[PDB]
Design an enzyme around this catalytic site. Structure first.
Site, short mmCIF file in Angstrom:
data_model
loop_
_atom_site.label_atom_id
_atom_site.label_comp_id
_atom_site.label_asym_id
_atom_site.label_seq_id
_atom_site.Cartn_x
_atom_site.Cartn_y
_atom_site.Cartn_z
N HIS A 51 0.88 -1.16 0.00
CA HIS A 51 0.00 0.00 0.00
C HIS A 51 0.94 1.23 0.00
CE1 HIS A 51 -2.28 3.25 1.62
NE2 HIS A 51 -3.38 2.61 1.21
N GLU A 81 10.78 11.70 6.42
CA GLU A 81 9.49 11.49 5.76
C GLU A 81 9.74 10.93 4.35
OE1 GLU A 81 7.40 11.95 7.94
OE2 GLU A 81 7.72 13.83 9.04
N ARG A 107 0.51 8.28 7.31
CA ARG A 107 -0.86 8.36 6.83
C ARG A 107 -1.68 7.10 7.15
NH1 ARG A 107 -2.27 12.57 3.15
NH2 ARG A 107 -4.00 11.15 2.61
N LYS A 108 -1.12 6.19 7.95
CA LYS A 108 -1.84 4.98 8.36
C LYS A 108 -1.70 4.82 9.88
CE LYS A 108 -3.89 3.60 4.75
NZ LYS A 108 -3.99 5.06 4.40
N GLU A 149 14.95 15.67 8.20
CA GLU A 149 16.10 16.10 8.94
C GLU A 149 16.80 14.95 9.64
OE1 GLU A 149 12.85 17.27 10.09
OE2 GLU A 149 12.80 18.47 8.25
N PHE A 182 -8.52 -3.71 -10.25
CA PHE A 182 -7.44 -3.10 -9.49
C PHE A 182 -6.11 -3.55 -10.08
CE2 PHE A 182 -6.22 -2.65 -4.58
CZ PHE A 182 -5.21 -1.79 -4.87
N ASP A 229 -2.10 5.77 -6.36
CA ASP A 229 -2.40 6.66 -5.24
C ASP A 229 -1.11 7.10 -4.58
OD1 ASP A 229 -3.94 7.83 -3.10
OD2 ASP A 229 -3.73 5.99 -1.90
N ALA A 230 -0.91 8.42 -4.44
CA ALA A 230 0.29 8.92 -3.77
C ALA A 230 0.33 8.48 -2.31
CB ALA A 230 0.33 10.43 -3.83
N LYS A 270 11.82 11.47 19.62
CA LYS A 270 10.51 11.88 19.14
C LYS A 270 9.49 11.06 19.91
CE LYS A 270 13.24 13.52 15.73
NZ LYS A 270 14.70 13.64 15.88
N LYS A 312 11.37 8.08 12.80
CA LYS A 312 11.75 8.88 13.96
C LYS A 312 12.54 8.10 14.99
CE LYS A 312 7.43 11.54 13.64
NZ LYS A 312 6.18 11.86 14.36
N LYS A 331 -5.69 -3.77 0.73
CA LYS A 331 -6.39 -3.21 1.87
C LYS A 331 -7.42 -4.23 2.32
CE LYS A 331 -7.23 1.23 2.10
NZ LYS A 331 -7.82 2.57 1.78
N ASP A 351 6.37 11.06 19.93
CA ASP A 351 5.24 10.52 19.15
C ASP A 351 5.38 8.99 19.03
OD1 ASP A 351 3.80 12.79 18.40
OD2 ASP A 351 4.92 13.05 16.51
N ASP A 386 1.11 4.28 1.21
CA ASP A 386 1.42 4.91 2.48
C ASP A 386 2.34 3.99 3.29
OD1 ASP A 386 -0.18 7.25 2.11
OD2 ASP A 386 -1.94 6.24 3.00
N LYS A 387 2.04 2.68 3.31
CA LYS A 387 2.86 1.73 4.04
C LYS A 387 4.24 1.58 3.45
CE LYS A 387 1.26 0.79 7.96
NZ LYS A 387 2.54 1.37 8.50
C1 LIG Z 1 -8.84 4.23 -3.68
S1 LIG Z 1 -7.23 4.97 -3.45
C2 LIG Z 1 -7.55 6.67 -2.84
C3 LIG Z 1 -8.31 7.59 -3.79
C4 LIG Z 1 -7.41 7.99 -4.95
N1 LIG Z 1 -6.31 8.85 -4.43
C5 LIG Z 1 -8.23 8.61 -6.08
O1 LIG Z 1 -7.52 9.27 -6.93
O2 LIG Z 1 -9.42 8.46 -6.17
C6 LIG Z 1 -6.66 4.45 -1.84
C7 LIG Z 1 -6.06 3.06 -1.75
O3 LIG Z 1 -7.03 2.13 -2.30
C8 LIG Z 1 -6.34 1.13 -3.03
N2 LIG Z 1 -6.75 1.15 -4.43
C9 LIG Z 1 -6.15 1.77 -5.49
N3 LIG Z 1 -6.71 1.50 -6.65
C10 LIG Z 1 -7.78 0.68 -6.31
C11 LIG Z 1 -8.75 0.03 -7.08
N4 LIG Z 1 -8.83 0.13 -8.42
N5 LIG Z 1 -9.66 -0.73 -6.43
C12 LIG Z 1 -9.59 -0.83 -5.10
N6 LIG Z 1 -8.71 -0.28 -4.27
C13 LIG Z 1 -7.82 0.47 -4.94
C14 LIG Z 1 -4.85 1.35 -2.82
O4 LIG Z 1 -4.45 0.62 -1.67
C15 LIG Z 1 -4.81 2.85 -2.59
O5 LIG Z 1 -3.66 3.28 -1.88
C1 LIG Z 2 9.99 19.83 16.86
S1 LIG Z 2 9.59 19.60 15.14
C2 LIG Z 2 9.65 17.79 14.85
C3 LIG Z 2 11.00 17.13 15.06
C4 LIG Z 2 11.95 17.51 13.94
N1 LIG Z 2 11.45 16.91 12.67
C5 LIG Z 2 13.39 17.16 14.29
O1 LIG Z 2 14.18 17.13 13.28
O2 LIG Z 2 13.74 16.95 15.43
C6 LIG Z 2 7.81 19.61 15.03
C7 LIG Z 2 7.14 20.96 15.03
O3 LIG Z 2 7.60 21.68 16.20
C8 LIG Z 2 7.77 23.05 15.87
N2 LIG Z 2 9.16 23.44 16.06
C9 LIG Z 2 10.16 23.51 15.13
N3 LIG Z 2 11.28 24.02 15.59
C10 LIG Z 2 11.00 24.26 16.93
C11 LIG Z 2 11.76 24.81 17.97
N4 LIG Z 2 13.03 25.23 17.83
N5 LIG Z 2 11.16 24.94 19.17
C12 LIG Z 2 9.90 24.53 19.32
N6 LIG Z 2 9.08 24.01 18.41
C13 LIG Z 2 9.70 23.89 17.23
C14 LIG Z 2 7.25 23.25 14.45
O4 LIG Z 2 5.87 23.56 14.52
C15 LIG Z 2 7.50 21.86 13.86
O5 LIG Z 2 6.68 21.58 12.74
#
Ligand SMILES: C[S@@+](CC[C@H](N)C(=O)[O-])C[C@H]1O[C@@H](n2cnc3c(N)ncnc32)[C@H](O)[C@@H]1O
Ligand SMILES: C[S@@+](CC[C@H](N)C(=O)[O-])C[C@H]1O[C@@H](n2cnc3c(N)ncnc32)[C@H](O)[C@@H]1O
Ligand SMILES: O=c1ccc2n[nH]c(C3CC3)c2n1-c1ccc(OC(F)F)cc1
Ligand SMILES: O=c1ccc2n[nH]c(C3CC3)c2n1-c1ccc(OC(F)F)cc1
Lengths: 380, 380
Positions: A14, A42, A249-250, A55, A235, A243-244, A274, A270, A166, A276, A16-17
């Site tokens: 998938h 990311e 995102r999951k 970063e 499919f 799909d991007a 972090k 991360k 999915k 999170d 996102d995965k």
């Molecule tokens: C349906 S797509 C999301 C909507 C899409 N971005 C669009 O342009 O409509 C989301 C996820 O569904 C799955 N998918 C993609 N094509 C599909 C298809 N033809 N039938 C069913 N699932 C599909 C993939 O896992 C994809 O990442």
């Molecule tokens: C702390 S950063 C996430 C971790 C980061 N990607 C890293 O490289 O460690 C997440 C969010 O915190 C905020 N942020 C960025 N720089 C920061 C700083 N110096 N102090 C506090 N918050 C900050 C911004 O809103 C940013 O999108």
């Protein structure tokens, strides 16, 4: 007393995965050389492209082209007929050092145990006694259906399968004094990318006989169970071409499938600073310890942090009516048994170890006896 | 009976939020010319870059360079001294048509009311009577603190402020027969990007006096309230330069701040056929209608779909013990009053209207009387 609950899962291919797995393959590559790497990677995936953005401050020398392509090869995207190929895709890198303002406020010149949280945020942990692994049945079944598709693709049983899939499972539950008891599977959805040659009826028959029946116990399936197998009807286009994908995102598939609660933070890409990721793993470890310790049947734990501050700002526990102890009593037990500073969680959960790519598909919880899945014996 | 709960929010210039706003500015640009545009626009932001990745099938002629730069200008990133500039940043576009396999399975040759869900998934709606707008106090306060920072930046009161900000609010609540009653604010965090000239003490004093006191009622603040103001100590580097942003990475900020539940789907950059957005908006509309209709004080609604299928696969309602009616009774009321097919939700909630950029900061719920915030009068 009965109700329905639905959870979903997705396969390794998938889009996102794919991004979560690549982000964690990059993290692991850094941790193999530098256990103290600061990583915030990311990944974005679209037709023919993997982009790394974020970063990283690390002493490691990492070959991003190799790490990315090897992760895509593992997933199974190895030919243009499948819509994506690790050998020939574009890998673009937009990685810079960690912001020095973040570094100075979080970890520079700080004792490891007293490192600050890498960001503010809230995180939850959840556990339920409805399964041995202390996870909701809906999400366990949904993950296992995707794992089964990947197994049958990799062993050549169903060679028309592609990596993008999915699944979705709706279970009918009974309420039991705050705890939940699964009764039956109400609905199953499966969608999976496939080749141009296989027909719809062959796919629907295989999904029911070789996938659903090989995963879901027959006692949960009956004449009223609804099946939506390949419901779109076609499919062939899939993966990043269809799909991007983006890292993080999951997050509901990664955790409890909608049960418990979520603070919004993504896990993949991360390092331990972090919160999170590290504090969500520690909260799961606390929740599972309270259930396996016999203090509750179902429990939710919330923690929160401020960037640069080591101790959590708040800690809350909800037992859904399944404990004889009050929230105040459970909080005292948690205070006596756990230290939720990130610089202590890293030691307890061994979070500098490069095992993160293994977490990035099929959920982060309820599998493989990762440190956060081994309950702590509680003293009180 | 008391407990703590924490929620966070972010400002318009937080990099993830920049992406959500750009994705929705692109959606709105398409809907202004083609109300039936199929849009799935993801945005990635990093130092000097906005990348659009996704799928759009539309009759509109959209100037992506102009739409993107105008959204960034609105946010306030207009000079390299701030770390990002709409005039001179790179705007890269990787947009393709919607997959024909998705189009044929979802909407091609289908009557509008009977269009299929654009994907599978689960979505939740939540409402609480603790505020007039039926939202948790934690998240309402956190959003208002970010809105206050943007107001003071834009009016020149605090000219050292930059667009990137995050806030976090912990409230101590009392339980009241399933409902929740806010008692006091336990902790507030505020972090905001700033210029090189302002000192830390000037910022901390302004955040307490001009931001917190201008937003949070004094009755909630006391001698024990904890303040973490600029806790990192320095935040000059910010926006995409400090942290890569992606669309759909603030889904808990977009909804209920951790309260209720979330199915995982992002809202921004998607047209109505993507039930991740339309069905979550409809579920909020149902939840708010049940509370404003006096049937419950607090309620959670889950719905789920399969790609290509119009009717929801499951519908569930949890009233937290705040209704005299059973879940079965509330489900019957919802069945008599709402039609949750996407092709009917689009008509009820006017989802072809280009108002989406307005939803992409400060939460999608509890503000501005959007159609999903106007309760339906229930007949039963
Ligand atoms: C349906 S797509 C999301 C909507 C899409 N971005 C669009 O342009 O409509 C989301 C996820 O569904 C799955 N998918 C993609 N094509 C599909 C298809 N033809 N039938 C069913 N699932 C599909 C993939 O896992 C994809 O990442
Ligand atoms: C702390 S950063 C996430 C971790 C980061 N990607 C890293 O490289 O460690 C997440 C969010 O915190 C905020 N942020 C960025 N720089 C920061 C700083 N110096 N102090 C506090 N918050 C900050 C911004 O809103 C940013 O999108
Ligand atoms: O515990 C029950 C009992 C009956 C019931 N009916 N619908 C629901 C939910 C709408 C699906 C019910 N829940 C429930 C409540 C919250 C929850 O976790 C997360 F979603 F907040 C999971 C299940
Ligand atoms: O209703 C209560 C009462 C006491 C209590 N103590 N901790 C919590 C939560 C851990 C924070 C409590 N909750 C609660 C439960 C679920 C919830 O929504 C979402 F998070 F699932 C929000 C609040």
């Amino acid at each position: 007393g009965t109700f329905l609950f639905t959870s979903e899962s997705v396969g390794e291919g998938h889009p996102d995965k794919i991004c979560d797995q690549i982000s964690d393959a990059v993290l692991d590559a850094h941790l193999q050389q530098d256990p103290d790497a600061k990583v915030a990677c990311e990944t974005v995936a679209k037709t023919g492209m993997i982009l790394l953005a974020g970063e990283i401050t690390s002493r490691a020398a990492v070959d991003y082209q190799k790490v990315v392509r090897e992760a895509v090869k593992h997933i199974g995207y190895d030919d243009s007929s499948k819509g994506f190929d690790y050998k020939t895709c574009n890998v673009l890198v937009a990685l810079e050092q960690q912001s020095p303002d973040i570094a100075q406020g979080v970890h520079l010149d700080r004792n490891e145990e007293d490192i600050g949280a890498g960001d503010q945020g809230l995180m939850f942990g959840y556990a339920t006694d409805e399964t041995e692994e202390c996870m909701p049945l809906t999400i366990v079944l949904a993950h296992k259906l995707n794992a089964k598709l990947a197994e049958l693709r990799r062993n050549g049983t169903l060679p028309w399968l592609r990596p993008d899939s999915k699944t979705q499972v709706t279970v009918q539950y009974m309420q039991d004094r705050g705890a939940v008891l699964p009764i039956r599977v109400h609905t199953i959805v499966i969608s999976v990318q496939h080749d141009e040659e296989v027909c719809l009826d062959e796919m629907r028959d295989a999904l029911k006989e070789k996938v659903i029946k090989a995963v879901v116990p027959a006692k949960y399936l009956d004449e009223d169970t609804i099946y939506h197998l390949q419901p779109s009807g076609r499919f062939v286009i899939g993966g990043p071409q269809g799909d991007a994908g983006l890292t993080g995102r999951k997050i509901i598939v990664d955790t409890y499938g909608g049960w418990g609660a979520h603070g919004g933070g993504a896990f993949s890409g991360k390092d331990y600073t972090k919160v999170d990721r590290s504090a969500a793993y520690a909260a799961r470890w606390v929740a599972k310890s309270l259930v396996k310790g016999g203090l509750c049947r179902r429990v939710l734990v919330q923690v929160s942090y401020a960037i640069g501050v080591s101790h959590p700002l708040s800690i809350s526990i909800f037992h859904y009516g399944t404990s004889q102890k009050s929230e105040r009593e459970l909080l005292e037990i948690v205070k006596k048994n756990f230290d939720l500073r990130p610089g202590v969680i890293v030691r307890d959960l061994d979070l500098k170890k490069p095992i993160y790519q293994r977490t990035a598909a099929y959920g982060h919880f309820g599998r493989d006896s990762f440190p956060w899945e081994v309950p702590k014996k509680l003293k009180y």
